[PDB]
């Protein structure tokens, strides 16, 4: 699976259900005229083939701000991480040293 | 009073002064999505009560991002803890039994 394929939210509930069955979860809130948030895209699917104990999946926060509310996301891309039915943290920017840091402490 | 009850700070200027005139305090910085922040709001209503000497405030990260950074704050939540109009140390995450004995020794 690739940053292209993964799970795209669309909806609060379908959010608060993932959460809860997964023990380990990554969303990528990001917008998509928001070049730093495109430059992690080949980052992502990296990590996603790197890490296949945990689910990942991705926001459009224009397209669904209630979700981006929800998770308080004003800054793109911000990646929020979920372990054993909770949300537990936040990675703000295109870091992606510190995103697989926050992954593999999960 | 309780979780819901104690001040929020919302600004710098609030935030060191309040520091300043207050001789046992605990800073509660958390987050609204944050599933530990959440889990400690009903131990933080019973610490209030227990420690009526201590005063409770309490700082949204997403919120107030700027307070957040003064306080070096990484994890969610975090306790800052203050003694004699200063910040003296952290209790990080959601563990009562820490944040309780830090709190003690105030």
């Known amino acids: 699976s690739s940053y292209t ?3 795209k939210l ?3 509930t379908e959010f608060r259900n993932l959460i809860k069955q997964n023990d380990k979860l990554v969303i990528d809130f990001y917008a998509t005229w ?3 948030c ?5 980052h ?3 990590l996603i083939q790197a890490y296949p104990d945990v689910r990942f999946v991705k926001c459009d ?3 669904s701000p209630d979700i981006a509310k929800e998770c ?3 800054a793109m891309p911000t990646f929020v991480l979920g372990k054993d039915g909770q949300l537990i943290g936040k990675i703000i920017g295109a870091n ?4 697989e840091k926050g992954i593999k402490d999960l």
Chains 1, 2 share one sequence.
């Open 34 to 36: 928001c070049g730093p």
């Open 10 to 12: 669309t909806n609060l």
């Open 96 to 99: 992606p040293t510190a995103l």
């Open 38 to 42: 495109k430059m992690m895209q080949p």
């Open 44 to 46: 992502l699917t990296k």
């Open 72 to 74: 308080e996301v004003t």
């Open 5 to 7: 394929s993964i799970t």
């Open 61 to 63: 926060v224009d397209e």
